[PDB]
């Protein structure tokens, strides 16, 4: 459960 890639 994670979003598209972070900064």
């Amino acid at each position: 459960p994670n979003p598209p890639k972070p900064m």
């Epitope: 459960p1 979003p3 598209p4 890639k5 972070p6 900064m7």
Partner: antibody
Framework: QVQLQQSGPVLVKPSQTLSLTCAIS??????????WSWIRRSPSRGLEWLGW?????????YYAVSVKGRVTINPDTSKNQFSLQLSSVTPEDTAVYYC???????????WGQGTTVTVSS | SYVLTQPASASVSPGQTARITCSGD??????AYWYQQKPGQAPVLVIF???ERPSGVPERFSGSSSGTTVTLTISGAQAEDEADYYC???????????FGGGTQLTVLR
Amino acid sequence: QVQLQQSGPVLVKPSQTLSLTCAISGDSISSDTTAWSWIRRSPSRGLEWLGWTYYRSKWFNYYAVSVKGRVTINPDTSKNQFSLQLSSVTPEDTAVYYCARGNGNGGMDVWGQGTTVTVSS
Amino acid sequence: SYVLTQPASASVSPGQTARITCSGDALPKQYAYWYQQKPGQAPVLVIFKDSERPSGVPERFSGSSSGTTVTLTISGAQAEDEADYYCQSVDNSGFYQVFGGGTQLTVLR
């Protein structure tokens, strides 16, 4: 190529439900583009975010906190579309609705034609 | 809840640099994006990855990050730029994206 086609103008009665469709061309809804987003423009509210849907691995759907309890984004993998279904509409929901795609880590490039919805009896 | 704060208006003269700002409490992280709204039609992406210009955009359009406060600097402003500008990014955990109120560039000309 990557083209988004929205539905036509809508007149929805004030207590009823709104249904909108965004059809895609040139790419798969299930790819890891992972935006397939809906948005709206109101005269004085401005650009407000509505909802998301990601990919096949597990179709995540996350909506804005402002409208979470009425919205629902549903992909149609048969037709290569994603739909907007907004419940208990309000005369304040009258706006112009757009749909968009994101390449993933870096954009909301592609946009739709727009859909003008009128919430009136 | 989460919020991206942006001014409401901005004015400049042609051939003059304009500087729009958008402050956010999660912008230290999560990258950032800019869009333009000329009324009547869909938005247009002007900058992404906080400084990366997409294609098709004039070289006058550029932006820095500066941590919690991101900006859009438009040099040698041409009058065709008068529009409403918007800043977008996403919350921590990047699970809900957000918008700003929107500035209105005037380009008195």
